[PDB]
Amino acid sequence: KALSAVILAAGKGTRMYSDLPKVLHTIAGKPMVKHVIDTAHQLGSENIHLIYGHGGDLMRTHLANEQVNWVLQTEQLGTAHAVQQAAPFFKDNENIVVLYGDAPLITKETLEKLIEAKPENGIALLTVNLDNPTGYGRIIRENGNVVAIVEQKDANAEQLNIKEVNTGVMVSDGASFKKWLARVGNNNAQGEYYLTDLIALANQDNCQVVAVQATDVMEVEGANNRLQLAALERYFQNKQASKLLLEGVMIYDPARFDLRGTLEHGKDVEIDVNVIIEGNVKLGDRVKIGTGCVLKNVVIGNDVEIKPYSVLEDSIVGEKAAIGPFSRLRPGAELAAETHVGNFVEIKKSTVGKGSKVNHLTYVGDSEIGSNCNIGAGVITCNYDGANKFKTIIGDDVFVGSDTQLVAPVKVANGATIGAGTTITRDVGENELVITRVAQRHIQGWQRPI
Amino acid sequence: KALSAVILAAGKGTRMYSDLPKVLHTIAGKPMVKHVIDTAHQLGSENIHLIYGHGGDLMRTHLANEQVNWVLQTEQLGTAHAVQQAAPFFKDNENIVVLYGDAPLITKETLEKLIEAKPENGIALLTVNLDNPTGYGRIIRENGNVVAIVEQKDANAEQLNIKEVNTGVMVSDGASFKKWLARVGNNNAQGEYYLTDLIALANQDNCQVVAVQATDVMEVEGANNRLQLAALERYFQNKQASKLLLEGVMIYDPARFDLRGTLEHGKDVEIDVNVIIEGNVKLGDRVKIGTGCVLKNVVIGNDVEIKPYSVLEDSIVGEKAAIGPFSRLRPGAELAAETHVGNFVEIKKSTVGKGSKVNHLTYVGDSEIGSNCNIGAGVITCNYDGANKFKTIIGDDVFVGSDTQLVAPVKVANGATIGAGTTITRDVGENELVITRVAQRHIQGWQRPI
Amino acid sequence: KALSAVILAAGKGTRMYSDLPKVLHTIAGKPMVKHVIDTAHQLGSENIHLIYGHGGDLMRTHLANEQVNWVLQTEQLGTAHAVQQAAPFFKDNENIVVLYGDAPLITKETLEKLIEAKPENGIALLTVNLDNPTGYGRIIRENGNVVAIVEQKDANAEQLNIKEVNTGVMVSDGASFKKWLARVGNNNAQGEYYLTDLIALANQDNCQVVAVQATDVMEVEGANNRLQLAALERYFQNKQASKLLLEGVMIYDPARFDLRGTLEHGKDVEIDVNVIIEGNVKLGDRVKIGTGCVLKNVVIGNDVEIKPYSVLEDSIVGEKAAIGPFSRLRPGAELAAETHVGNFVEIKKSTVGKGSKVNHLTYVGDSEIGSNCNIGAGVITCNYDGANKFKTIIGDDVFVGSDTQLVAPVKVANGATIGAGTTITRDVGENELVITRVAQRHIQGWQRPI
Ligand SMILES: COCCCN(C(=O)c1ccc(Cl)cc1)[C@H]1CCCN(CCc2ccccc2)C1
Ligand SMILES: COCCCN(C(=O)c1ccc(Cl)cc1)[C@H]1CCCN(CCc2ccccc2)C1
Ligand SMILES: COCCCN(C(=O)c1ccc(Cl)cc1)[C@H]1CCCN(CCc2ccccc2)C1
Ligand SMILES: [Mg+2]
Ligand SMILES: [Mg+2]
């Protein structure tokens, strides 16, 4: 049968000490709540009802593109009240899963088991085994069904030794939710309407509640503060790294690896320590990434080596290229196959053709460079003091001598040769050699202050 | 009542294999003994008696400014002998706490409890629970008082199972210390005068000894070698990071964060992996620090982003500035609000005014740059081959073309424009355009070696 | 008596998802099998028989220089069959130790104990204690001898609680191996000839089998996939770091330190976080290495400080030199004592004499620079567009002004002074001052687009 999700995401998150609401804090570069939305979508949820409240305007700006029903809750009166805000939209004969926007690590796999376990007209409750369950609601089983959730303050001696506790995550059909939520009261020390009370209500109705245990405690943990958030981040990154290792990516140290997006990879890829991969990154076969590299939204071809401390963003690199160390590729950098980019080089919105080399102390911006060019150390593309910024076009087989300025807009045709120290303002023709005529004064017998 | 401290700091630290004495090795950038001095000061110690010996001259140079009584011990004859060196300076009616200079993690909070627990004319002894107490002196309690410390070699079967052991840290009044230290003997296998024996002596006198348990084993651990020192360092850094996380600083990975000094922070600060903060650093609201940055003695204003692999020292950065990646700020760099400093740029002892940009492959030293200037790629401030190094003064709204050398001392007035490739030796006036007249030789039909 | 080793190294390593065979994957920069070859050599092995198969051509290219007997196995029919391939080469009266090429952490010390424990005409079997021994062959002891290895599926209730299990590593004399290997059958579920069966065969012969327990589980672990490989890497790096710490090297964080080769060190060396040491590196007394440095095949003299994010390869650095931050030394860089190399500087195949400074935004390649030279910011050595690349020779006490190009081949004699912005193509004589005569156009009243 069909499925929809309710995600509880209204909290202020006071102990984050932030201007953001609780669920917008990121794990692996995306809001905690976005992790939960994605998991709900992967489960096959038809609708996702997002209960929100605090930091409402920020929620709407940061999650503007999410396919959710925006359910604006004006007051937090407990979890049952929050779910009831979405209940008018539940289909009678769809399953509804309730999830927490501050618990981003919950897995598709655990939730599939939870859904499959739900008996007709009953509830599947997600539980977790703790070595120290003190403070948490104990699961009481009679046969294979949950007959009660007994809170710490009510439990007798034997019940206190129960390690299985309630997580608050559960699945039931939409009609059952509508019926039982209307029967939840707030007669308790907090004066809140607790979703937890659905278990008692289901048992009152001779409906079955079945428990499913989470495989991992971290799977169900939420973050109330940034220390807990960092714990979630580390667990998530380790799990991501472990998956990649098992797929055949050599990550030298999975504790010093960060993925904040998606990684597509070939075979025999090697990633050294302290690499950060962000956005959508594709690495071909036998790509080697050296220590300290940052790759964001990049495509790297087969057999490329990126040497240490290279930072690349929104760039494409052709097969057998060599980049780094200390190379900077800025958005729109497109390096062809067999190119070479070296230390203290910055390439921005430029194409560099096959076999060309830009190996030192150079800025190339808004440029087209052809194949088998030699761009000398200290070369800079620049503009006049004007309005917009124009293009430098360099053909194939061009030699550009060291410390030359290329002043856009300018074109240098195939086979041209430019001497060191030149200022190029006029177009250079095919097979034209341009050399600067210097005037020097030579003074003999100049004794240095020494 | 008043309090003074005695810190035992005379050791050679042979297993460090160092020319330094034991307690001068650093944790978080400061000598282990300095941690203990500071803790003693925070407890409210009136006097701090520093028992020193080995590496005496180094102790005096490295701790020259510490408010301690320098008690030079000529021979190490045991801990009681060391404390007795300071005893002539104890006030009869002040409390004295004994601390170890190689155990830097001891907390103010534990020591406050220790002091409060001390009965009149008695001793408060700091103890610690170990899962494997083998080798350590077992605490024997009768009622709530310590009647003996039984060493491993003397303990019977049941005593060996006692997990509570002696740390050697204790508090008693000055008069009691003077009396009991004079009664300590050295009749034991080591031939040493042990401070430990004060417990037996107090019990001989019908004085009460009360135990206080350390909350953490690491709190009382000392470092005898650099492996142990690195364990202390990691524990300390984790604790510092955890405190900052709970205060609302987003530290992406607390295991890859180092603070070696003090950090003042606003709200919503984000610090990526492998950042080192040294000296006194102040970060405003919503500061973002990218991976691999090193900040030492810096003030950063609100809304500044420091991009990866930037190294800043003794510098000030105004609000909404953007620094990095691969930027270097050297001492005396002062960047105004809304400034931009980019890759492979070095700024030393220079002021850069509001809105100005220095984005590539540039050295600016000993300079004043005004507001809304454009400092082109490859620009260098330099000097004549002379004696001292002079200043470059650039006004507001100046454009400096790429690969220009500014030869100090020189002044460039408001609104001036300098063409690329220029050598500026003479002052440039207001609204003056300076462009280099190049002489080039053009040779047609130059066929490259290809 | 003499010793030889057999190393099992034929596996495909399917779950690595690699074009390499299993044992060529690296730990600390060298193939797993090379670790085991080296350990075998350190034990005093006269012959090392390398059983290989899958990825045969790669094995031969990657291990071409190893002193092993290459035993090419055409089919994997079990571990006994593999060892039997080498058996014709066993001396009757030498001991033979059997090792696994995918278990690189096995120690010399454990193996020495194993060998010493072997009774005449018997076997010493390496075992390991596991908290969860499920799936592994249980060691049955009667007296102090191993009478059986009982597999999981055969063990009774009490045998299943045995924590001691078989590793498959063992020592016996060559004649015993020849005899017993010929009696191993393949009547089991896998249809394989198991080396394990030698224990049963020895007991059949009234020969003694003695167990020796591994000190560490990780010591005997193999890597079947890259997740396991990364676990081995981390354990190995920690152990290496711990050894260095105990020798007196201050490694600020041993979890963020990598050694991939050998390190020779003096006293009071300090290594900050995220340093990688590769190949053969020698550091003198009081060398300080800042964060993010990479040193490969380098010799560093006493009292050198390498500041953060410096990358050095195949280079020598004299005493009291200062390198970094953001410095690049490429192969053949030789820096004398008291030299200074600064940010965004690249030195390649060049010698730099005592006291000389190259502090910013410079490339020096194929050069000899003498003592007490001042190489200004933006200086570049370059070549004509030609064939091979020629040498720049700079004498002692030379000043090279900022943004000067030195066009090889060229010689600059002692005491020469070169003005900023110069292009040097002709040799400069002793005490010759060369300054560029610029032509500038000055336009007054140029109002900037503002
Ligand atoms: C008093 O200590 C409080 C705080 C104790 N805890 C934490 O601080 C913590 C919270 C979140 C993370 Cl990610 C890491 C640690 C953990 C300690 C381990 C058990 N869980 C709770 C597991 C759970 C999750 C959802 C529903 C029910 C139970 C809380
Ligand atoms: C034989 O193993 C020796 C060495 C055993 N230990 C260490 O090597 C060690 C020492 C210091 C650190 Cl920071 C980390 C480890 C630890 C193991 C855990 C207990 N403590 C001692 C705790 C203590 C501290 C002060 C007073 C009394 C007890 C020593
Ligand atoms: C079902 O879980 C399988 C996998 C379980 N294991 C692993 O995945 C693992 C394997 C290798 C490493 Cl380095 C780290 C972990 C470990 C878990 C700990 C015990 N050992 C085996 C120890 C051993 C080594 C050699 C011979 C005999 C025993 C395997
Ligand atoms: Mg230049
Ligand atoms: Mg120039």
mmCIF file with all atom_site columns, N, CA and C in Angstrom, chain B residues 135-170:
data_model
loop_
_atom_site.group_PDB
_atom_site.id
_atom_site.type_symbol
_atom_site.label_atom_id
_atom_site.label_alt_id
_atom_site.label_comp_id
_atom_site.label_asym_id
_atom_site.label_entity_id
_atom_site.label_seq_id
_atom_site.pdbx_PDB_ins_code
_atom_site.Cartn_x
_atom_site.Cartn_y
_atom_site.Cartn_z
_atom_site.occupancy
_atom_site.B_iso_or_equiv
_atom_site.pdbx_formal_charge
_atom_site.auth_seq_id
_atom_site.auth_comp_id
_atom_site.auth_asym_id
_atom_site.auth_atom_id
_atom_site.pdbx_PDB_model_num
ATOM 1   N N  . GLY B 1 135 ? 50.109 -2.252  41.094 1.00 0.00 ? 135 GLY B N  1
ATOM 2   C CA . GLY B 1 135 ? 51.274 -1.389  41.248 1.00 0.00 ? 135 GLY B CA 1
ATOM 3   C C  . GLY B 1 135 ? 51.066 -0.129  42.084 1.00 0.00 ? 135 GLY B C  1
ATOM 4   N N  . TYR B 1 136 ? 49.808 0.222   42.341 1.00 0.00 ? 136 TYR B N  1
ATOM 5   C CA . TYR B 1 136 ? 49.451 1.478   42.991 1.00 0.00 ? 136 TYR B CA 1
ATOM 6   C C  . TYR B 1 136 ? 49.027 1.264   44.450 1.00 0.00 ? 136 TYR B C  1
ATOM 7   N N  . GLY B 1 137 ? 49.179 2.308   45.266 1.00 0.00 ? 137 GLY B N  1
ATOM 8   C CA . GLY B 1 137 ? 48.796 2.265   46.668 1.00 0.00 ? 137 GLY B CA 1
ATOM 9   C C  . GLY B 1 137 ? 47.288 2.265   46.845 1.00 0.00 ? 137 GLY B C  1
ATOM 10  N N  . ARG B 1 138 ? 46.748 1.193   47.427 1.00 0.00 ? 138 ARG B N  1
ATOM 11  C CA . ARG B 1 138 ? 45.309 1.052   47.672 1.00 0.00 ? 138 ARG B CA 1
ATOM 12  C C  . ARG B 1 138 ? 44.820 1.906   48.845 1.00 0.00 ? 138 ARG B C  1
ATOM 13  N N  . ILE B 1 139 ? 43.675 2.553   48.670 1.00 0.00 ? 139 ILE B N  1
ATOM 14  C CA . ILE B 1 139 ? 43.056 3.362   49.711 1.00 0.00 ? 139 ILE B CA 1
ATOM 15  C C  . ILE B 1 139 ? 42.211 2.454   50.615 1.00 0.00 ? 139 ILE B C  1
ATOM 16  N N  . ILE B 1 140 ? 42.533 2.437   51.907 1.00 0.00 ? 140 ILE B N  1
ATOM 17  C CA . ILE B 1 140 ? 41.767 1.678   52.889 1.00 0.00 ? 140 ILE B CA 1
ATOM 18  C C  . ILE B 1 140 ? 40.895 2.667   53.624 1.00 0.00 ? 140 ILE B C  1
ATOM 19  N N  . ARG B 1 141 ? 39.579 2.495   53.506 1.00 0.00 ? 141 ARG B N  1
ATOM 20  C CA . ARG B 1 141 ? 38.602 3.308   54.225 1.00 0.00 ? 141 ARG B CA 1
ATOM 21  C C  . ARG B 1 141 ? 38.029 2.550   55.421 1.00 0.00 ? 141 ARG B C  1
ATOM 22  N N  . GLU B 1 142 ? 38.008 3.209   56.572 1.00 0.00 ? 142 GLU B N  1
ATOM 23  C CA . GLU B 1 142 ? 37.240 2.763   57.736 1.00 0.00 ? 142 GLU B CA 1
ATOM 24  C C  . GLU B 1 142 ? 36.346 3.928   58.130 1.00 0.00 ? 142 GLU B C  1
ATOM 25  N N  . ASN B 1 143 ? 35.030 3.708   58.074 1.00 0.00 ? 143 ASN B N  1
ATOM 26  C CA . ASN B 1 143 ? 34.034 4.784   58.036 1.00 0.00 ? 143 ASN B CA 1
ATOM 27  C C  . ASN B 1 143 ? 34.186 5.560   56.709 1.00 0.00 ? 143 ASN B C  1
ATOM 28  N N  . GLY B 1 144 ? 34.242 6.890   56.767 1.00 0.00 ? 144 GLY B N  1
ATOM 29  C CA . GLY B 1 144 ? 34.511 7.698   55.589 1.00 0.00 ? 144 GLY B CA 1
ATOM 30  C C  . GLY B 1 144 ? 35.900 8.318   55.608 1.00 0.00 ? 144 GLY B C  1
ATOM 31  N N  . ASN B 1 145 ? 36.836 7.705   56.340 1.00 0.00 ? 145 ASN B N  1
ATOM 32  C CA . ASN B 1 145 ? 38.204 8.226   56.467 1.00 0.00 ? 145 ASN B CA 1
ATOM 33  C C  . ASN B 1 145 ? 39.289 7.245   56.012 1.00 0.00 ? 145 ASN B C  1
ATOM 34  N N  . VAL B 1 146 ? 40.360 7.789   55.437 1.00 0.00 ? 146 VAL B N  1
ATOM 35  C CA . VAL B 1 146 ? 41.472 6.992   54.941 1.00 0.00 ? 146 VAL B CA 1
ATOM 36  C C  . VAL B 1 146 ? 42.392 6.651   56.105 1.00 0.00 ? 146 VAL B C  1
ATOM 37  N N  . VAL B 1 147 ? 42.461 5.371   56.459 1.00 0.00 ? 147 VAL B N  1
ATOM 38  C CA . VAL B 1 147 ? 43.308 4.923   57.565 1.00 0.00 ? 147 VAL B CA 1
ATOM 39  C C  . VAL B 1 147 ? 44.654 4.402   57.104 1.00 0.00 ? 147 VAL B C  1
ATOM 40  N N  . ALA B 1 148 ? 44.772 4.071   55.822 1.00 0.00 ? 148 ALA B N  1
ATOM 41  C CA . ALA B 1 148 ? 46.049 3.617   55.270 1.00 0.00 ? 148 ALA B CA 1
ATOM 42  C C  . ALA B 1 148 ? 46.074 3.669   53.739 1.00 0.00 ? 148 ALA B C  1
ATOM 43  N N  . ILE B 1 149 ? 47.282 3.726   53.204 1.00 0.00 ? 149 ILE B N  1
ATOM 44  C CA . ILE B 1 149 ? 47.551 3.552   51.788 1.00 0.00 ? 149 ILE B CA 1
ATOM 45  C C  . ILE B 1 149 ? 48.467 2.351   51.719 1.00 0.00 ? 149 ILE B C  1
ATOM 46  N N  . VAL B 1 150 ? 47.938 1.244   51.209 1.00 0.00 ? 150 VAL B N  1
ATOM 47  C CA . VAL B 1 150 ? 48.652 -0.023  51.218 1.00 0.00 ? 150 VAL B CA 1
ATOM 48  C C  . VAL B 1 150 ? 49.234 -0.293  49.854 1.00 0.00 ? 150 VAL B C  1
ATOM 49  N N  . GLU B 1 151 ? 50.556 -0.381  49.788 1.00 0.00 ? 151 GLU B N  1
ATOM 50  C CA . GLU B 1 151 ? 51.254 -0.580  48.524 1.00 0.00 ? 151 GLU B CA 1
ATOM 51  C C  . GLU B 1 151 ? 51.024 -2.004  48.006 1.00 0.00 ? 151 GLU B C  1
ATOM 52  N N  . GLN B 1 152 ? 51.166 -2.163  46.691 1.00 0.00 ? 152 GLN B N  1
ATOM 53  C CA . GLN B 1 152 ? 50.977 -3.440  45.991 1.00 0.00 ? 152 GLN B CA 1
ATOM 54  C C  . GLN B 1 152 ? 51.632 -4.611  46.708 1.00 0.00 ? 152 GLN B C  1
ATOM 55  N N  . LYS B 1 153 ? 52.909 -4.461  47.038 1.00 0.00 ? 153 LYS B N  1
ATOM 56  C CA . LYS B 1 153 ? 53.700 -5.550  47.625 1.00 0.00 ? 153 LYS B CA 1
ATOM 57  C C  . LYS B 1 153 ? 53.267 -5.986  49.035 1.00 0.00 ? 153 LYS B C  1
ATOM 58  N N  . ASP B 1 154 ? 52.498 -5.140  49.722 1.00 0.00 ? 154 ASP B N  1
ATOM 59  C CA . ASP B 1 154 ? 52.027 -5.418  51.086 1.00 0.00 ? 154 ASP B CA 1
ATOM 60  C C  . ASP B 1 154 ? 50.564 -5.873  51.163 1.00 0.00 ? 154 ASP B C  1
ATOM 61  N N  . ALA B 1 155 ? 49.784 -5.602  50.118 1.00 0.00 ? 155 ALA B N  1
ATOM 62  C CA . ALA B 1 155 ? 48.346 -5.812  50.174 1.00 0.00 ? 155 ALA B CA 1
ATOM 63  C C  . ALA B 1 155 ? 47.998 -7.302  50.249 1.00 0.00 ? 155 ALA B C  1
ATOM 64  N N  . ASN B 1 156 ? 46.968 -7.638  51.028 1.00 0.00 ? 156 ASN B N  1
ATOM 65  C CA . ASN B 1 156 ? 46.435 -9.006  51.078 1.00 0.00 ? 156 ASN B CA 1
ATOM 66  C C  . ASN B 1 156 ? 45.485 -9.217  49.899 1.00 0.00 ? 156 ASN B C  1
ATOM 67  N N  . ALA B 1 157 ? 44.922 -10.418 49.780 1.00 0.00 ? 157 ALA B N  1
ATOM 68  C CA . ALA B 1 157 ? 44.038 -10.774 48.662 1.00 0.00 ? 157 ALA B CA 1
ATOM 69  C C  . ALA B 1 157 ? 42.881 -9.801  48.446 1.00 0.00 ? 157 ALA B C  1
ATOM 70  N N  . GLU B 1 158 ? 42.132 -9.489  49.502 1.00 0.00 ? 158 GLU B N  1
ATOM 71  C CA . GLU B 1 158 ? 40.984 -8.590  49.373 1.00 0.00 ? 158 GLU B CA 1
ATOM 72  C C  . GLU B 1 158 ? 41.401 -7.143  49.067 1.00 0.00 ? 158 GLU B C  1
ATOM 73  N N  . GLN B 1 159 ? 42.533 -6.707  49.623 1.00 0.00 ? 159 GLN B N  1
ATOM 74  C CA . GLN B 1 159 ? 43.011 -5.334  49.410 1.00 0.00 ? 159 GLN B CA 1
ATOM 75  C C  . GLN B 1 159 ? 43.440 -5.120  47.970 1.00 0.00 ? 159 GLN B C  1
ATOM 76  N N  . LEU B 1 160 ? 43.995 -6.155  47.352 1.00 0.00 ? 160 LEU B N  1
ATOM 77  C CA . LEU B 1 160 ? 44.404 -6.075  45.949 1.00 0.00 ? 160 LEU B CA 1
ATOM 78  C C  . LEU B 1 160 ? 43.235 -5.793  44.995 1.00 0.00 ? 160 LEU B C  1
ATOM 79  N N  . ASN B 1 161 ? 42.016 -6.153  45.395 1.00 0.00 ? 161 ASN B N  1
ATOM 80  C CA . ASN B 1 161 ? 40.817 -5.896  44.587 1.00 0.00 ? 161 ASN B CA 1
ATOM 81  C C  . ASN B 1 161 ? 40.251 -4.489  44.740 1.00 0.00 ? 161 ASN B C  1
ATOM 82  N N  . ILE B 1 162 ? 40.789 -3.721  45.682 1.00 0.00 ? 162 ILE B N  1
ATOM 83  C CA . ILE B 1 162 ? 40.430 -2.315  45.820 1.00 0.00 ? 162 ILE B CA 1
ATOM 84  C C  . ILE B 1 162 ? 40.881 -1.557  44.562 1.00 0.00 ? 162 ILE B C  1
ATOM 85  N N  . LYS B 1 163 ? 39.943 -0.841  43.950 1.00 0.00 ? 163 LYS B N  1
ATOM 86  C CA . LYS B 1 163 ? 40.205 -0.082  42.725 1.00 0.00 ? 163 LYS B CA 1
ATOM 87  C C  . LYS B 1 163 ? 40.622 1.367   43.018 1.00 0.00 ? 163 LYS B C  1
ATOM 88  N N  . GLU B 1 164 ? 40.271 1.873   44.194 1.00 0.00 ? 164 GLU B N  1
ATOM 89  C CA . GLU B 1 164 ? 40.632 3.233   44.570 1.00 0.00 ? 164 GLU B CA 1
ATOM 90  C C  . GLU B 1 164 ? 42.113 3.304   44.992 1.00 0.00 ? 164 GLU B C  1
ATOM 91  N N  . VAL B 1 165 ? 42.877 4.185   44.347 1.00 0.00 ? 165 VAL B N  1
ATOM 92  C CA . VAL B 1 165 ? 44.304 4.326   44.631 1.00 0.00 ? 165 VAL B CA 1
ATOM 93  C C  . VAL B 1 165 ? 44.736 5.779   44.871 1.00 0.00 ? 165 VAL B C  1
ATOM 94  N N  . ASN B 1 166 ? 45.910 5.926   45.480 1.00 0.00 ? 166 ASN B N  1
ATOM 95  C CA . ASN B 1 166 ? 46.483 7.221   45.856 1.00 0.00 ? 166 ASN B CA 1
ATOM 96  C C  . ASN B 1 166 ? 47.095 7.937   44.654 1.00 0.00 ? 166 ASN B C  1
ATOM 97  N N  . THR B 1 167 ? 46.817 9.234   44.516 1.00 0.00 ? 167 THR B N  1
ATOM 98  C CA . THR B 1 167 ? 47.465 10.050  43.481 1.00 0.00 ? 167 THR B CA 1
ATOM 99  C C  . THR B 1 167 ? 48.663 10.865  43.959 1.00 0.00 ? 167 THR B C  1
ATOM 100 N N  . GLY B 1 168 ? 48.795 11.065  45.267 1.00 0.00 ? 168 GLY B N  1
ATOM 101 C CA . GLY B 1 168 ? 49.849 11.920  45.818 1.00 0.00 ? 168 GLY B CA 1
ATOM 102 C C  . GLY B 1 168 ? 49.493 13.406  45.906 1.00 0.00 ? 168 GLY B C  1
ATOM 103 N N  . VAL B 1 169 ? 48.342 13.788  45.365 1.00 0.00 ? 169 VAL B N  1
ATOM 104 C CA . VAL B 1 169 ? 47.844 15.150  45.454 1.00 0.00 ? 169 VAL B CA 1
ATOM 105 C C  . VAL B 1 169 ? 47.035 15.247  46.750 1.00 0.00 ? 169 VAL B C  1
ATOM 106 N N  . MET B 1 170 ? 47.270 16.295  47.522 1.00 0.00 ? 170 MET B N  1
ATOM 107 C CA . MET B 1 170 ? 46.646 16.440  48.836 1.00 0.00 ? 170 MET B CA 1
ATOM 108 C C  . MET B 1 170 ? 46.650 17.879  49.310 1.00 0.00 ? 170 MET B C  1
#
